[PDB]
Amino acid sequence: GVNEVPDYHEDIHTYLREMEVKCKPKVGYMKKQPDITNSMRAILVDWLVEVGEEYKLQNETLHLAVNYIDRFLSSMSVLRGKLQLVGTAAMLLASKFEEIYPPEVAEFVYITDDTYTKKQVLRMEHLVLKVLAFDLAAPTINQFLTQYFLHQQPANCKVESLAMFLGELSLIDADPYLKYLPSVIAAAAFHLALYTVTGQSWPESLVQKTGYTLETLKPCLLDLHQTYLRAPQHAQQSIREKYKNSKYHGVSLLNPPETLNVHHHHHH
Amino acid sequence: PGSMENFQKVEKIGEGTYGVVYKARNKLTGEVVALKKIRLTEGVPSTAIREISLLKELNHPNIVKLLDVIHTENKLYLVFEFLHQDLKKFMDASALTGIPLPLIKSYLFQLLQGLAFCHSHRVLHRDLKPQNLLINTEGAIKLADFGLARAFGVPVRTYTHEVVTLWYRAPEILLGCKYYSTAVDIWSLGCIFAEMVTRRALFPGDSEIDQLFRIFRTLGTPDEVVWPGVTSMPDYKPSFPKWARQDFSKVVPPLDEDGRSLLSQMLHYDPNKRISAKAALAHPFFQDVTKPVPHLR
Questions:
Q1: Which of these, A202, A251, B98, B224, could form a disulfide with A161 (CB 3.0-4.6 Å)?
Q2: CATH number of the domain bearing residue B55
Q3: Which CA distances in Å does B51 have to A54, A134, B48, B56, B85?
Q4: Which structural domain range is residue B273 located in?
């Protein structure tokens, strides 16, 4: 029904596929960052995850914040000492965009263990808005995921939770995930969750909707499957911990499949 | 892109979410604009965050153009295109004539275009009312005031409940429904459609319960047949009076069969059955539509 906007879903999907290209960070921004690294960013994103858990924020807010950071980091050089200020302002903007009840600025100042002043956060906020020219309505892995889920026959909450978990994991690791668009990671995560839980694969339905095939998705799948297998050993643990919660049907506890058995369909 | 030096303040237009709106003139190009000023304690307000970021993407002839955003000292200025009047003021100027049917039809069709564009771009307006609809001297009408607007996902999540000026608020909101979608905007346009015809608000409630009882007294109290699930909505009460649906011809007596058909599909109780902006555009009501200029200055 209307909650899944039958009259607009197709238009909405076409629009987000064009906006994801326009809101795409530069894949090689970290090399041009003199003083920060993939690992630093990984720590930051891992921290935002906990901030999100602490304030019981939406997953969408988290994804918006990472988008802002990466786009910001694409044009602006940042010292390691100020990476966290960038991320705090990001998360503040995300929250005000996306949340019914955003945390107060003061809350945001406090989660930085008084590393930064309130004046610093509000200034950074303004800086971030100028660098992004206020383009804050960026598409997320979520916006695609929730659409993809509509193709589940039948609906399955372990699939849904497992997909988000995988989609979140990818936020942590600029390498390789900057290479991939949201719509592609969502597709890979969706397939991988479906396969792990039900044994099934990317549906023709989503082939029609997206134009992506398992062949298209393979490079992102190979990567995302490896991240799942190595999730327990990653230096960053905040996402797995989060997804132990009943709220997300404890999916981080599900065992990843050993192989993907991804094959070629002959003359299809 | 711009600066405040090149703008000449003309006069106060109105008073919006950020305080006063001012008519001004760009001294270099001659363009007349409206300026919203936002004095920048909690940083940039979320309302402005949404208004600016959603309007940047919504370029359509029936949505007011955000021209620029100027960041001066401790202050933020929004530059919009200037529209002479709003619809409320024009309905009141039209008291003895009514709005001519050509104009009601032109304006409704334009509203539907503007809203379909919003919906196709995953935006809910969530405050459609005559005061937020701007008309120019050329016959355009445009959705304005996007401070209560929101970028939605598919399917929708629970968003803010304190949405839509009461007279224009859809029943699924009054009944505290967990989820609401694009049908809330269609409901608003329905109320406005009726309002253009009569020059008075269709459901002028004095409170949330009063609003719901006026709706019920006009369209009938909904039951499981008309609206499956209604009796289980959080703010449904079994003791609600059960009013009978009135001849819908009696809701807007001067409206003819096509207008009535369309209006009824805008004010359908069930948000699943309520007409979409996109589908409304093809309604037979608009078969002869044109876009004439307002009949009054």
A1: A251
A2: 3.30.200.20
A3: 28, 10, 5, 8, 21
A4: 85-295
* Separation between Cα atoms, residue B203 and residue B195, nearest integer Å: 9
Query: What whole-number distance in Å separates Cα of residue A81 and Cα of residue A120?
Result: 13
Out of B49, B64, B84, pick the residue that ends a domain: B84
Instruction: Find the catalytic residue in B127, B185, B247, B270.
Output: B127
Residue B18 labelled as part of a binding site: yes
Domain stop point among B84, B119, B144: B84
Domains of chain A: 11-24+138-262 (1.10.472.10), 25-137 (1.10.472.10)
CB contacts under 8 A, A 109-128 vs B, are 121-122, 125-126
A27: distance to nearest CA of chain B, Å? 24
* Domain shared by B148 and B50, yes or no: no
Decide if B249 touches A, using CB distance below 8 A. Answer: no
Examine the domain organization and report whether B102 and B53 are in the same domain: no
User: B55 and B188 in one domain?
Assistant: no
Query: Residues B16, B102: one domain?
Result: no
Is the Cβ–Cβ distance between A212 and A206 less than 8 Å? Answer: yes
CB burial of A204-242 (b: ≥16 within 10 Å; e: otherwise) equals eebbebbebebebbeebbebbbebbeebeebebebbbeb
Instruction: Domain count for chain B, please give it.
Output: 2
Q: Are A39 and A177 in contact (CB under 8 A)?
A: no
Mutant choice from A2, A23, A99 vs B, greatest count of B C-beta within 10 A: A2
Measure A232 CA to nearest chain B CA, in Å: 31
Between chains, do B153 and A122 touch, taking CB under 8 Å as contact? no
**Contact criterion met (CB < 8 Å) for A2 and B274:** yes
Q: How was this structure determined?
A: X-ray
- Residue B235 designated active-site: no
**Partner residue facing A15 (CB), from B71, B120, B182:** B120
Query: What tokens does B242 get?
Result: 């059960």
Domain match, B188 and B276 both? yes
